[PDB]
Amino acid sequence: ASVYAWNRKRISNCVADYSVLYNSASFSTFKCYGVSPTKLNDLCFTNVYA
Amino acid sequence: SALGKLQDVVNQNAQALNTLVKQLSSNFGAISSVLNDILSRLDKVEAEV
């Protein structure tokens, strides 16, 4: 999406592995603001919004 | 109502303990009131702050 009209896909009803994402070294940034990226695999959530 | 002096001494301790317990819920400017949630969500270098 163009940033004037950003998309917001709901992610729900799944098992995730954020280490797969974090290990994608092609990502130029992975800053986290209320959780640590190492801890994500121990957590669970009601929803994630992409 | 006659035993006010004794009941007051019990009531003061009840208010003091209930305040001391309620204060565990106060954030004190941390991101959460619950120590185990900080330790679940955050890694040492941030969690120590």
Swiss-Prot record, chain B:
UniProt effect for mutating residue 12 to H: In strain: Omicron/BA.1, Omicron/BA.2, Omicron/BA.2.12.1, Omicron/BA.2.75, Omicron/BA.4, Omicron/BA.5, Omicron/BQ.1.1, Omicron/XBB.1.5, Omicron/EG.5.1
Annotated consequence of substituting residue 8 to N: In strain: Delta/B.1.617.2, Mu/B.1.621
Effect of residue 39 to F: In strain: Omicron/BA.1
Coiled-coil intervals, chain numbering: 7-49
Impact noted for substituting residue 40 to A: In strain: Alpha/B.1.1.7
Function: Subunit of the fusion protein that is processed upon entry into the host cell. Mediates fusion of the virion and cellular membranes by functioning as a class I viral fusion protein. Contains a viral fusion peptide that is unmasked after S2 cleavage. This cleavage can occur at the cell membrane by host TMPRSS2 or during endocytosis by host CSTL. In either case, this triggers an extensive and irreversible conformational change that leads to fusion of the viral envelope with the cellular cytoplasmic membrane, releasing viral genomic RNA into the host cell cytoplasm.
Protein name listed in UniProt: Spike protein S2'
Residues of the full protein shown: 943 to 991 of 1273
